[PDB]
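Q: Structure for this?
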Amino acid sequence: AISKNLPILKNHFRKHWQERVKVHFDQAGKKVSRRNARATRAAKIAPRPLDLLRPVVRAPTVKYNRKVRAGRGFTLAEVKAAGLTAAYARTIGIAVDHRRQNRNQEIFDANVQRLKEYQSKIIVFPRNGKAPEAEQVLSAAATFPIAQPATDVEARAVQDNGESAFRTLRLARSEKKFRGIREKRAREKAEAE
Amino acid sequence: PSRFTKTRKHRGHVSAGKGRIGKHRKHPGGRGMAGGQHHHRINMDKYHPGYFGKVGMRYFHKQQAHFWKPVLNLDKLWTLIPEDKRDQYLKSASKETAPVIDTLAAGYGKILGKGRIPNVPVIVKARFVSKLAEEKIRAAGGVVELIA
RNA sequence: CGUUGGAUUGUUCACCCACUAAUAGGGAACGUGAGCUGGGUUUAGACCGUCGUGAGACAGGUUAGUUUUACCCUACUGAUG
RNA sequence: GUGGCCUAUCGAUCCUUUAGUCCCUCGGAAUUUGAGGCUAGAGGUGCCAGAAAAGUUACCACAGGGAUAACUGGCUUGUGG
RNA sequence: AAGACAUUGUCAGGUGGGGAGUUUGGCUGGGGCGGCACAUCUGUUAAACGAUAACGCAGAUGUCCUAAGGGGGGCUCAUG
RNA sequence: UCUUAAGGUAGCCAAAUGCCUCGUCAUCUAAUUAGUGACGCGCAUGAAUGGAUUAACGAGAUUCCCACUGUCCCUAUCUACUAUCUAGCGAAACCACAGCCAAGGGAACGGGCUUGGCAGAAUCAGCGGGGAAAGAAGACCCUGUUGAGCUUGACUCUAGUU
RNA sequence: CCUGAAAAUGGAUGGCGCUCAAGCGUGUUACCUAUACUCUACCGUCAGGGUUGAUAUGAUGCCCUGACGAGUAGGCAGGCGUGGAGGUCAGUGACGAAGCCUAGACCGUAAGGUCGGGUCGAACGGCCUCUAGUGCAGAUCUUGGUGGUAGUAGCAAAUAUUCAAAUGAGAACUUUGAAGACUGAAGUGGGGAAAGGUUCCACGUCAACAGCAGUUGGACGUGGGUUAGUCGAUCCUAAGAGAUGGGGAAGCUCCGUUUCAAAGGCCUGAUUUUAUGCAGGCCACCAUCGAAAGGGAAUCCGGUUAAGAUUCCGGAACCUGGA
RNA sequence: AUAUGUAAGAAGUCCUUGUUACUUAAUUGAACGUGGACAUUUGAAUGAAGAGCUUUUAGUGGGCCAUUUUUGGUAAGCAGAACUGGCGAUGCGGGAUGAACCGAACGUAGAGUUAAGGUGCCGGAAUACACGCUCAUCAGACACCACAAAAGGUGUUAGUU
RNA sequence: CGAAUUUGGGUAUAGGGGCGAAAGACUAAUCGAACCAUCUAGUAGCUGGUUCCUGCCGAAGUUUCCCUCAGGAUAGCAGAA
RNA sequence: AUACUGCCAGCUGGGACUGAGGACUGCGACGUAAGUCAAGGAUGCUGGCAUAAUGGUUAUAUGCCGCCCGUCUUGAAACACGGACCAAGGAGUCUAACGUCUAUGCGAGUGUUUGGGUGUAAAACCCAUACGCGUAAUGAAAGUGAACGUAGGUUGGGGCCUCGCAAGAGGUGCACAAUCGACCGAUCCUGAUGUCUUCGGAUGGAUUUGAGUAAGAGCAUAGCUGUUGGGACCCGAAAGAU
RNA sequence: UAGUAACGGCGAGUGAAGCGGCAAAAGCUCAAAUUUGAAAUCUGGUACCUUCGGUGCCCGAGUUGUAAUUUGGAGAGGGCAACUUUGGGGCCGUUCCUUGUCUAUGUUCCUUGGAACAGGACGUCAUAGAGGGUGAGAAUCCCGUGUGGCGAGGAGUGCGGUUCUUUGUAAAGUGCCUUCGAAGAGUCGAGUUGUUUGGGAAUGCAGCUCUAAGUGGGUGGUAAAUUCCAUCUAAAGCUAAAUAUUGGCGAGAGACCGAUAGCGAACAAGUACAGUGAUGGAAAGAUGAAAAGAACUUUGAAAAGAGAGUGAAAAAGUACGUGAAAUUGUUGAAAGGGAAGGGCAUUUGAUCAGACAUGGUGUUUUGUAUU
């Protein structure tokens, strides 16, 4: 029923929720299993860095616009500018993403620099050599970290010219709001002589 | 701590604190929000006015990322500077050497003028700003420039 | 100290025929169903009249319709001790 | 003088509909139509703080109720005597 | 024989207690029938503040009015 | 003439249908709310929702007569088997504690309480006054925002069919 | 005071009883006794305070106090017990743990704790904390066990048993004689069907069972027993059930049974430089299941067993299939 | 009559004033003030086993019974309402007995005194004291309460012309 | 009591179905909708029960609304902090 | 003179119950002296026994009391219901999301434990860019978005400061309460320089309105109690479905 | 994200997704192209061999299309200037197990006891003091445990070296493009109906009707020409890991339960028994260290009893660990005139605990650090 001054709570428990209860007792055991799987795959691929090299990309929306993070793979344009074919990049451990485009020069340079750094920092064993192992590292991500680009200096000179940056916002919003009506007026005035 | 409950103290008393006349029954008033217009209307009108009906207009597929715009006030504006350089910036209150505050990397979307920053000039980079905040920054001698 | 026998009615009341000394009125969980009976009422079957579109209704009328147990304690009646 | 000399003569949510700014939104920019919002009325709940609603059961069922009827008993004694 | 009509598929309108699911108010000197004491108003009950019950008593309401609203002026009504 | 189409015809009746009602008359009896025969403004008879009649039939309902008789006046006696006592064998229902009354008061009908009466081990056979005895969470009645069977001009649908 | 003044079990100024009362009206006075009042002791609660001292005191520690104390529903607080858990008592214990019995003792207002004495046999407890499937008188509670009733109701339908002997520890009930009876040929006789399943038959005695008994038994233990060409099944079709071909259905499956289907089997030639290959013939039931009473190939007598016989044996026949 | 509103002060009582867009014909008013005068009585009584509450939550939401006012009803141990007090929820002493009446409310004990009710015996306590009345062939005997009336009687007792 | 007869076996009809010379009869002691398992520990404003001690405090049956009248919300009364 | 009232800080007796406290303290009295005492709670003397004598327990007897518990109920001993008996079992639980309060940690921040590292292999122990909540509100929404002042004035305020030999005066006044304002949002208005001449909306306001500002208080964990959904304190339908 | 946007008699209730952090990460291939100077492809039959197969030959399939080539990220009759690789059946071995085996230390003395595994003394090993067994609580008695060593087999491009050697015209990129660039139809899409979703002038799905197009088509969460956008490329297909796992097999645990509990079942438990059937479905653990399970004698017809005997115990006798209560029998003790039980108080009878060894004095020696 309903009673004294209390919040209205919506506890969605009118189905047979007790059949669908997943209490994670296996958290510790699953962490152990995940570490064991990582170690076993490392032993399997013993010279290899246990993961692929990912590119730096920008987060999509306006809320995460500021952040730069790790994407899925490098653009075909990026691997071309680095100087590799897509298939060879995949074979020597560079993640390649075909569907991602670079409309951005800054991100293009950042990822080309990442590719050059990876090429310099890795050694490809020959197919018929002595396999000079080099104390495998386990994380391309940890050895090629994503760093947020520095946008500005800590101190600068005040450049004031008298628009207050609020009148600017108000006016830009106004032009966006009224552009269609203004185009209407212009077209009507051109049409009616 | 089952041993600190009143169930432990009700052992031996017949009704378990629920009364002899009006006993502990299953759902004597209904289940959940039952009868909020009929017999729980008094509780609804006293403690949750505005509960029934609809007022505004809908928004199909509303994403809160569009409306992300945390607000930063002027009194907290100077906390965005590291504490080490904050004293130097406060003491050397000069133009042409003003510190740059990029509130977007700080995590804020709009700047509001809650008042009383010092008279140290400062370059403030903000997506949005309020009129009073811009006026107070100008009075302090700095500038707010719009970013995206 | 008595206050009956009957015709009709399931009847209580009635109402007649008689006898009689008289056929007074009542109570006892409207005494008394592990005392009886079961005519009536009062389940289920069925008919009729009126009512209801109907299913059905009707202290309206008809007909057929399982009446269980004491060996215990008291009380009582007798019987030992 | 903010209806009737005073004390009665009346109506939520949701929905619809009208009036008002022609003000906000249709979320990739919009001619424009359409639709959705903001404020005030109207369409009504008379069980009037507002469910959307025909019976029958003598074939009946369950949860209960001596909170409540049909005996006795109890108070009363109008009525009867 | 029959023939692009029957048939069959889909949608649409009838019909459809044959069947399905539901429902069939409350108060109440038991319930039912009656009434409304269910939203209200006047007088009394009501016991000289206010409040105060009963299916208490005597009634009334769901309307009516462009004047039967508002202002001003003039006049005075029933009856003998 | 009016409602609403027609106004109950033939018949039948206090009828298994008539409340008033134990209708009124006759008969049957010593006496008849019974029976039969009549009479019908018949609450509310009546024509295949069949009316009237009807031989035969009926573990159908009802009245009277003869016969017969323990139904009864008004009880008595006899037989078998029980009950009964013994050997063996041996349950159950019930059970708050129990078991003598009168009155009082009390949830208004007490085994207990109050005031009286009283009051003597252990018991057997009967008995049906009491234990408001036992048997069953009253089947009547009401309530429940509990059902179900059935019906329909209820609400909402539906298979079929068109 | 009397009349008015009548209700049912016997009967209540509470009873006995009381008459210048132990009645009625009134008036001093004495006396009786509530958990009330006064005053003391003690318990607890609340409150207002005191208290920093060189050791011998974990400061709501010690202490001064004044007032107060009913209680259902209900709230809160301090505690008492139970099973497990972390610490500790270098805790108790086969020289006796835990349990259990004990009108023995002490402590606490109590929940309860501690101990003495019996029984015994392998674990258990105090303290600070943690935890909960943590405390029962009831729920016509659950499951077990047990009563009074109670050596009671009862063991009374189907006519009925009696004498002797044997066996036996033991005989109303077993066996054998003798008598009396009963069913009375739509039987209490002799066989079978369904069903049962070894109960059939022989050999051994009280544990249970046979509502008494039991030496007996359809009980118990151990064994033995059912013989077919002819009797049945098997074969046939009945009402019907049901594959296939086909068609439905998401499908489990449903319909359909000869339907809009290309639906199979007995004689000589082939029967050895060559096989069942071939102008060798007739053709066209239109699966199958369904009867221990329907239809149907054929066995009788005598004898034999503890227990089987239309089955075994003896004799005498018949039917079916095979150059 | 009872019941009932308010007031009995320091937020109070009195002065060229200070503010204002309100108000006035008008520094006239209205409101709010600065600056000033009020003490051992700061403006009746009694009490105040602390005063202002803040949050949160239980049970309850069938009531019933007094003296009183009262409605319906012939009335009811009936039904329904009054400032109240009780029972529920509460034992104790008394009314023999009884939820509610009277007395009085409760920690465990001891002395004393009482309440209501009682003192012939049951039964603790005067068969006390004092004046009357009453004799019943259904006496009477103490509230709530467990009942009696109209009308009568040279029964007896006491009271005007 | 010679047939609308009685009966064995086989067979068909299965649960909102069957079957009924009709009684809501019969359908495995089950019938006004069988039995079995499951949904299901169905819901119950209704009945019953609800387990240790002591200490302190200590009620309400009233207000308003409610298909509200055996229930609830709300205010009041009470506890604790 | 006696009554009868009243007073005596007037005298003389006869009984009963109690004896709390326990290292000097006080107030008093006694010819006003060292001392004594009946003055802030009993001592002195004496006897018997030293045991079941006192007392405890237990059974009985006696006097007076005492109805059967639980339950629903205005009211139960009830001629209301359950209960013949005994043993064992037997009924407010856990979870998700929360309200008040309280303890703790940190605090304009807070939360390690989704993960990663490590480990004495579910424990430790160590590691944030994120995310949640908080730090901004308001409006349906476009949007706008919190100092005219010592973060305001007034009344009251604990505490602190200055105080004379015991009054009480002054000052400063946090929390908190009452009030008048100021600021932000919404609504209704009046609308300045300018101008994509229809836009932007300065300025001034309004018996209007908000879960706001006005020198942050929250976040997390735990505990009692309360809430809702869940079998939901335990047992209980008539039914309904597959 | 988020109990949010939305849905909902907008009531009760319901209710996702993008982003963000992380775990895991992996990519791709058919149809649509003429190899046309050579169906270059493949099943099968029959032979040979190194047989999860490989080679002669033969038939067949197949041109109504089997190979190579390309898959939208792209890709397709050629030519330059330095330009990695190959690939294939074995053997020693990286790697998981049926797994096997070996590897320490007291059973030394005394006490109690039936038993020492308990108490005491002395020891020893310990990368082993986990657990279990053994006649009681055992690191050291046994099995094991800890640490290492040595082996009875199987699976074999996550690979270092051998192994016969390259089928000596074997398959892959740009600094310049001569042309292009085939891309899935009763399918998108539209309507309508039903269902479903948070999806709201309709989210997905399905039935019916209509039914396309090539800068086309889908989407862009409010129904309808567009000056422009943005973003993918459907109606064909494959693909480990992180994820799930009340079943099966193996293993390790628990602040769980402890025989009315825990699964219904600790046991000849889905058993016995109940139903025609679907189905329903219990009860039931413990002698002792060891049967040493009671020889023998006596009474009895016998069961059995009484002795005796084994045993630590028979107060463990198979009806067996102690055997509680209800309920009984016997003995003992008490009361009892239509209940019993209870409270206060005493009495009587039973029964019983509380200084008299002592922080103080002192003495005629009980049995002569003092009694």
